[PDB]
Amino acid sequence: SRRRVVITGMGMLSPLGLDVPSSWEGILAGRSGIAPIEHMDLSAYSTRFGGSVKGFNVEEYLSAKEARKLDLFIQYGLAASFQAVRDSGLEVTDANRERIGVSMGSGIGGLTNIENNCRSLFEQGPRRISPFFVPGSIINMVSGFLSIHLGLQGPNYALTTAQTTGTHSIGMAARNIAYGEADVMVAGGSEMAACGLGLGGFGAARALSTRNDEPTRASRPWDRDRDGFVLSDGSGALVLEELEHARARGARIYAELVGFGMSGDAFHMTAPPEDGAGAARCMKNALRDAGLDPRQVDYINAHGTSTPAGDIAEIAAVKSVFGEHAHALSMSSTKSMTGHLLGAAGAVEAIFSVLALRDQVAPPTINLDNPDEGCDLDLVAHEAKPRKIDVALSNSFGFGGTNGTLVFRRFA
Template sequence: MPDRREAWITGIGLVSSLGEGVDAHYEALASGAGPKVDETRFAPYPVHPMAPLDLDKQIPKRGDQRQMEPWQRYGTYTAGLALESAGIKGNTEILSRTHMIVAAGGGERDNSVDIKILDGLRTAGNKGQFLNERLMGDLRPTLFLAQLSNLLAGNISIVHGVVGSSRTFMGEEASGVDAVRIALSRLHGGTGDIFLVGGAFNAEREDMLLLFELGGALMHGAYAPVWERAAGGGGLALGSMAAFLVLEEKAHAEARAAKPFARLASVQSGRSRRNAGDVAAAVTSHLDALGPLDPASSAILSGAVGAETATSEERAALAGRGLPVRATASLIGAGIESQFPVNIALAAIALSKGKLFAPFGADAIEAPFAGPLKQVAVTSVGHWRGEAAALVEAVD
């Protein structure tokens, strides 16, 4: 559609194990310095821990900080960075009509309370009565409410004053895909001029590691880059991260002299089974739907997280396309709900700099690339579901 409204990315907030903000991530990825991985704290599971954050910079009230779980702090903090990056932080007129779409998990557990309750149940005479008493007496109302996924959007509204419409998606990697896809669709369709979209994930949680281990999804032992995990059976190295994007209609951005990092042109998604060949077919279909990419000025940021056989199938689908590939999870880990927004942010950062990140690992698919960067295809292949691809382009 030649008259379709254009979606600019005018603000980026990003935190991960590599640091905070646009420049920190570009420098870490462009230098080829490698990941920051903790292999001992949660052994045998390697985890990419969150970089130190000065929460006071974006969440000034300590009371607000205390009532949030870590993943909510990461998301609220990063939303503030995105609004600041876009130049609209504190602008009540724009924030009053800024729509918010969030990808979120189900909240965090209080491990110490859980352990006490489970221990007590072993010897309790009336187990039902004991459980009710403990749940009533041991769980603070704020703790209970912190389990609700839509509190991330609520906290962003409270702390930063983003009070347009709000929508929260759950559903692991697919929720991040849908958050970005629907924000773009609404912007293209004219039901909003400016959106705050993103998600957050805290990997440093024993309950989350248990959840993924019970599903057989985690890698064990020494860390390895994503493409090199198949020989050991594959698996995820979870990573704490958060990303929020300010997605803005071109004319709206130009009217306030906002400069774009990049343009979000398209998001393709679908539901793929995991029979042999299904992931490869889905990746191929989604990339084909984005249109042709010029090998002289294009690259792929892969959302592969190491899950097998999905990662091997994605690699096979990407290898024949003649484009350099970067598997970002090798550097920052698997961020589940936040994975797709994080990768869109990283693509926009690379395009704003005009240069692709350095290769990482020994796999030939991560070919060197020195040419000017004009287009980046971002894939998503969730550990179980969440296949998608997006096209992010440079703005001349």
């Protein structure tokens, strides 16, 4: 019968910091992590900025020997995973290693590695492709390498649901524990898509903000002057744990994961429907899964990408689901500060939602100077809002019309 799932450990690399506390301090202070990109010449590109991880030292985690084999998205996912496991206090033993698994996802995986090996193939020939190209680039190898380093023998998999990945990874990992397939899961996502192929590919779709002359103001969810998402890098990982397992070992519990929803839009390969129908179906699944009155929802960490169509679809969905209570909850987009970490977005945002519960504060939507037509909810414009938060919802939406919602609440 379905068991309860709690969060005992969290870990992160973001554009705001090299761990959770440093990232969260930036979130509550309204700081932007967005800056012109330094790692490549982007003069031929329409977008030349994004949310980079600043000062990442892989030798805090891995030998230089091993680090050289791995795409940055794997390095970031392992860094977040190691933080989360250490934060949990969990000791892996022969008695429990079969009951601990990992579901760390990515939207794109090792794009830097692919580009670099494609350059070798075209300029030199196939004999110059790295022997480590496949195991060092493909998406499941955060789950794989973490399992090898910590001896995790439980369910070992990876989701790839584009901008929904982190949310789906956490929800499905919670189902593994709920249904008895595991007692512990490390789950979340990681992404490093900031190479020519990534900025070029999103650029070709005209999906990205082109505010190159003022990057900290580019990401402006629900602002009438928004012009697309800001591409960002990093990782979130959480340790999910069966409740009685956590209680038995005296774990610190941050919050309980009470609900998870998925739905497909079945609308369009890339565009969300303007009315938010799929996001509404997804949230209602998640609230019913959590056994909640929708009026119990205090805080929503929106997907809030700063696209014209996405941001308005989310208002329409929240109004449809919550009716008059839509005017009582607080909803914010931390992408205003972090940008869009794509497959890691739902992972860092799940962590921000849990910290909103721990600290009783709604993070701000920075840059919300002129709310667009119909964007008239409490969007926590400019400044963090201390408030009562018993229930927090984290939403994600992605290419293929794929929707995820996580529902967290305080644990006593």
